[PDB]
Amino acid sequence: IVGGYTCGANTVPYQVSLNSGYHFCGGSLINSQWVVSAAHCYKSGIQVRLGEDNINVVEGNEQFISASKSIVHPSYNSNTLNNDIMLIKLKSAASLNSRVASISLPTSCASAGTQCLISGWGNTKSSGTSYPDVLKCLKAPILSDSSCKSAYPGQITSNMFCAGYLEGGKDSCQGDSGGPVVCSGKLQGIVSWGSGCAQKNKPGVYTKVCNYVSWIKQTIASN
């Protein structure tokens, strides 16, 4: 997250860190047994870490649970990143408490202008590399699809939306991938891609979760 602030320990209780010997992507807990992340974060051998703040220090509120199954969207296209979403089932249900909680799926899509909260442990430098150990947060609004499409001609589909600032300075980045974009208490996006991080007229692009609620519900109830 570039140009953001330290969230505060466990102030984003649905944020998950996906680990394969190191943190490589974020995710969101949707219920005690399931996590939604991005399909471009797919890997075999994932351990989900809940209740994290510093990912290098066991501070006492963590739960490390291995994934039993991953399901990448049936129509995910790794070249265009269209339908960039994946579900991960936990081997054991997590214990929900103040520090570990799930986030609600949306009942409708959000409007351009809505302010959201994006979080993660990804890179914090636009022109450089600095990976933080504690969770960073960023408040950013959903942008109009026209400013999104003018920034990425022929690359945006109906399953994507842009959020951020066109002036640059604030954006999600590598390492934030798969993490949450929450607006009005609902998970509306998943960190997916962008051009570099925090560059002018290159906002971040997010998977439009309101388009996959039926697929999510149907898939977790049958697995």
Ligand X SMILES: NC(=[NH2+])c1ccc2nc(C(=O)c3nc4ccc(C(N)=[NH2+])cc4[nH]3)[nH]c2c1
Q: Which residues bind ligand X (CB under 6 A)?
A: 24, 40-41, 171-174, 176-177, 191, 193-194, 197, 204
CA dihedral 100, 94, 189, 117 (to 10 degrees): 10
In the set 17, 70, 119, 177, the catalytic residue is: 177
Judged by CB under 5 A, the chain residues 133 through 192 that form the site for Zn ion are 177
Residue 70 interacting partner from Ca ion, ligand X, Zn ion, none (CB closer than 5 to 8 Å by kind): none
Q: Which does 26 bind (CB under 5 to 8 A by kind): ligand X, Ca ion, Mg ion, none?
A: Mg ion
* Whether 175 contacts 131, CB under 8 Å: yes
**Strand positions, DSSP E, 121-203:** 136-141, 160-163, 180-183, 186-193
Binding mask 149-188 for Mg ion (x = CB under 5 A): ---------------------------x--x---------
Choose among 169, 134, 142: nearest CA to 52: 134
Two structure tokens written together for 62: 């963590």
Q: How far is the CB of 61 from ligand X (least distance, A)?
A: 26
CA distance 89 to 188: 20
Does the annotation flag 188 for ligand binding?
no
**H helix or E strand, kind and range, residue 146:** helix 145-151
Q: CB count, 10 Å around CB of 176?
A: 30
Q: Is 133 a catalytic residue?
A: no
What x/- string results for residues 52 through 91 when contact with Ca ion is judged by CB under 5 A? x-x--x-x--------------------------------
Q: Which of 120, 164, 168, 189 binds Mg ion (CB under 5 A)?
A: 120
Q: Give strand pairing partners of 189.
A: 181, 208
Based on CB atoms, which residue is closest to Mg ion, 54 or 147? Answer: 54
Q: In the annotation, is 23 catalytic?
A: no
The full length of the chain comes to: 223
| Secondary element (H or E) of residue 216 | helix 213-221
Q: Has 84 been annotated as catalytic? A: yes
What are the tokens at 45? Answer: 């051998």
Residue with CB nearest ligand X?
194
- Classify residue 111 by its DSSP letter: P
179 contacts which partner out of Zn ion, Mg ion, ligand X, none, CB within 5 to 8 A by kind?
Mg ion
Catalogue the active-site residues.
40, 84, 177
Interface residues with Mg ion (CB under 5 A) are 26, 120, 176, 179
- Binding-site positions read 52, 54, 57, 62, 171-172, 174-175, 177
